[PDB]
Amino acid sequence: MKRIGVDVGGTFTDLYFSDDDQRIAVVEKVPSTPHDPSEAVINGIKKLCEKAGVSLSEIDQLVHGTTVATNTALTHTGAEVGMITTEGFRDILHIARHKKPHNFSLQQDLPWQTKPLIKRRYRLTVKERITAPHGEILVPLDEDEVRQRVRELKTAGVQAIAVCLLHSYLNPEHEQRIGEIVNEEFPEAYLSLSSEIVPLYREYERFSTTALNAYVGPRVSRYLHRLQEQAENLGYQREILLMQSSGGMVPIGEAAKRPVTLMMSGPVGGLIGGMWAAKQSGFENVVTLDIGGTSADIGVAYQGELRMRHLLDTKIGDHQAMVPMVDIDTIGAGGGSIAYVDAGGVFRVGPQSAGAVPGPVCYGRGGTEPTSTDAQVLLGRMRPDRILADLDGARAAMQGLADKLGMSIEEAALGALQIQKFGMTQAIEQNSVRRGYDPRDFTLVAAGGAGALFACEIAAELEVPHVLVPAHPGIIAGIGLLATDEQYEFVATNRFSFASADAAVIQASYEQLEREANAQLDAEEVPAERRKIVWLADARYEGQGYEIRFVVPEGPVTTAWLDQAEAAFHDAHFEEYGHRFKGGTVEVINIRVEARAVMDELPTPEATQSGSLENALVETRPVTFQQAGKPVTLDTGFYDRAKMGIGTTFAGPVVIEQYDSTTVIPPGFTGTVDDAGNLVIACPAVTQTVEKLATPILMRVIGGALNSAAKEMASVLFRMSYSSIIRESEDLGAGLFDKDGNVLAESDSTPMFMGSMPKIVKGVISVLGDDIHDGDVILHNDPYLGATHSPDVAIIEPIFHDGELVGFAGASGQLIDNGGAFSGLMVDIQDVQSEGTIFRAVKVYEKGVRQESLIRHILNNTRTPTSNEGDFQAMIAACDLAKSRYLALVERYGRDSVRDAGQFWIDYSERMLRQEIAKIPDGVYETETGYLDDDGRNYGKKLPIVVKVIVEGDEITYDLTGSSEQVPTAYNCAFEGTTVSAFTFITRMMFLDEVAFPVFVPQNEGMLKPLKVIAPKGTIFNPNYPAATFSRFSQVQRAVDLALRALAPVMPERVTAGNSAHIHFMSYSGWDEKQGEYWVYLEVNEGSYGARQDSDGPDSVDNLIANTRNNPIEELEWRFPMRTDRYELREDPAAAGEYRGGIGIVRENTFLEDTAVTCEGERHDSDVPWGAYGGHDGLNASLIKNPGRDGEESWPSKVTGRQLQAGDSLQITVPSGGGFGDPLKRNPLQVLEDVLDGFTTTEAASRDYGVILKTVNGQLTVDLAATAVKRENAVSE
Amino acid sequence: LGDDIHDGDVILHNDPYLGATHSPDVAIIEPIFHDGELVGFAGASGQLIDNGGAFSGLMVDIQDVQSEGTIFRAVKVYEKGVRQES
């Protein structure tokens, strides 16, 4: 009946108050206090109630939109957290998924390791185990140990404790018992059980959710309690509600128990508020757009409902989570984006941010670079007398951008805005075109900041005729608080497939969730005559690894209910990707119940006013628009919109100046003001005049579109794939090519497909020739015609327009099995024919007609036919999608324009790489001969690797003379595709780093040109046919690491010390009798990372050429017959230095059935990881069957098909890296942390580093008196 | 195949779990048609020198059937008499 909503953004505080019978809406804002968030809400309420003259005791409900929990996790300003976890897994929050954020960087630090929420000194272990799938107790709980660990945590001074055991979502009795011990021994400690925060599987994501919860728990619990107790003293007798990131109210008590759901809340309110203003006029389909000061938030609401984001995309800053969130696209192109031409002569805006501190110099603030917002001033969209209420400070400041491009005086500003428009529009079209949305039906809605500026421009590109702006864009966040309804989410993990399902267990699971939902609603005193309950489910095809959420019908679960739910899955899949699989089984993973309580809908406030243009017309200043490309200045008036009434539909180019927003209407079109205060502008979609564009803009538009096509085809292929190597390792490549085969656009998904796609398409062109027709689909994997290695299979489709070949679209990924000599992986084999099936430009669809017999023959020759068929379908779908997006610009601009735009980016890439190679002094750079362990067929004999690097001019050559001859195993590297690809990748890493280098250079044909690799025929790096090249990874890893050691004397700042430069690529496989199928698990064990000159080396992460993700343990134990019994950091210290070398992991996998094991190992009995500038050397790996038990065997690095029976375990120990610099110059304040964490021992701290740590007052501290003495007498010895 | 038998068809087969001796022996079957009516089959089979398996020629120490080489499962060589070049 009487409701208020308060939202706190970070500078301003917005308050909205509405009434049903009185029909009064009050708008009020109040300045916010950043140091104390409580003193901004209370004061706000005090200002709201006094103006209207109402009492707080009459409010039915109030909603709060704070963001304190976000700023605590982002700035890492929370509490000391302890962890009681299963013993042997003490390092899970350290490992993460072992994937770096960036694929092509060497100077990047992992945020979860560098600033961890639970430090390693406070992570403790308890001996017990609970096993899937039923939840039996394998190891009994010891009662003395748990109490001792709790008391240790209490003595240290731990404020919050996060209990995180494996499989606690299955049965939580161990965590419950631990909690009941904790509360009685440590009453004043925040406690979080992982089972009660998110009872779902995936242990890293669940423990990270729990650890974030426990990290921000003590802070926001205090803030919420203070807010509730202070509001009650004012007179508020009810309970306060809190807005979550999924859309929904939740009371204070439950909000203090799950703070993790409050983080990143407030962009969601904008989308819901936009839906509210859109449904007044009558449009159900909405596209909301908010351009703020730094970023742009985009939200697409089809028919008027929210869209939940993908699991992989759910992350708070850098840490993952499993909290439900609304899919909102954040784009860097906002108010703070700098416009510049780089050294390669290319126009780009962003992603470097200017900030609000410098500001535009025309307003009189002080700046030194051209900004996105300063471009709006030049054209006249923003008045130069708005904030205040030099003039040429903007025109003359862009001289360093205008004349340097060949632009006109006034057209420079237009370019900077059009580039942002297109960047946002292809972001939208990525998530609009494949979804199957007709843009004419939709409506664009603006928001606060600068949202209405790009409204008609973007709608023209999308072809959207309706543009709507709400009555007050500056409060849409507050209004969207009140539009949503109080709902509770209760979830469970309940894995079933529709093939073998029971309509009684499912009903009981949903009834359990319903029981707890009704019990939650009983405590809030809500009548039973208004409780609406909706059921949902997360499902996926069998073989995939991520789910889609969709609404299932109302209960009870009957026989027809199953059919309706299975149909709803296909409807929700088709709507997200745009493809329909021809087979496969659907399985539900998680179930959800939302118990909504619709109390009353928010009515539109109908108020009427009177006015005209003549009331507030102040003056007329010149304003510049785009007239068919040319800049023509024209007259423009200014007046406030708070003076006109309803039906004041007037024409003329005018600029509306509201207190919070701006609305500028294009000339020649009128804007209708409806009764509700909204405006509907008749924006043009199809017009009769062709406009002009400058040279810098046209290249970026087509290039960005080809780029977006590459990344869109990548995401479709990898999200829909059945293969785990394509899905988790991201071992794929995709992009668009021209007639000659030169790549124009590439997905950049993995370093393993660097420059290898052009070789694939050129290899196809050279074997087919003119035998290229329309509707053709081509398979290719030949490693002597450009492929990386046999298991990666590529699909190419010709592109035709009016019977003329214009290009190609291509996608490639690694299958699980290709029908080779061993399941999965292989080392000890004869030649290339032993590797499996080779495809040599085999065409899949002749003239568009599917050759059923050819598809069937291919699918009969693999051990995993269901997975392989799924991967073929996903690759064909991504190529179809890219062909569509290419023909779109062929029709839009022209065939010659598309060919020319593709040629421009090749020479941009080449120019940028050559400028960097030319700066290194010319010469010949050498190093020590590296060694590899035996080939595999004959143990003992080492294999040398010599890398010499020659630099002459703007060209670089890698000479591998002196490397070994061909070995008769698969332990060789393909020259074009692997050797050239790896040295192209290390060149890009060395000179074009993602972190240090300012701009991101796309992967085209121009990167492949400025380097050459000379490797004599008949070596391991350039073998003669028919040598097998299946196992290629470790050789090129060591080769590029030796290339780093060779160039270390001249380039220290862009290299690293001795990396592990290895892989332990494992294949565990067996035959499942019940399913009648092979089960294959392919594991990529991460290595470690040698130190750098400026920062230490991250432990436990995929190194150099690899950037894979691990499979979660709980998913593995549900899917395969195994049990990971240990996964942590190795015990011995790794390597000393000024910056420490990285530590490897020791993973102990035990097995429950007879399994076969193949390993691609390296660095067991051979050369140690090196160090630099006097840094120590790392350690070699090992492979031991049954550590500390009966049957220990010291396995070599590379094995092929060794058997394990049952109860056997493999202890895989991976190498540790080397250090960089002399250990005697390390910081004294850091070795203290290293000893307590367990990185290095106390006895070996005086020798290598030379720091004396003495125990004083119980605690260990660094003494600055005896440290300087020891450093003197440590050089001579 | 069943009723998926047309004139001018040529069929390749070597599956040892569907009647073959062992993988290296590959068979060719051709349907015989008279007045649009199936009347019989003609068939020939022999051992190739190499079938693209794990080792050249012969093999003993290998994993399973998929490591023996290529499996043909009633593959049509000539659909309706026209040669499938690809």
Ligand SMILES: O=C1CCNC(=O)N1
């Ligand atoms: O997953 C991976 C890592 C090693 N090599 C490869 O081809 N894929």
Ligand SMILES: [Ca+2]
């Ligand atoms: Ca691969």
Ligand SMILES: [Ca+2]
């Ligand atoms: Ca024979």
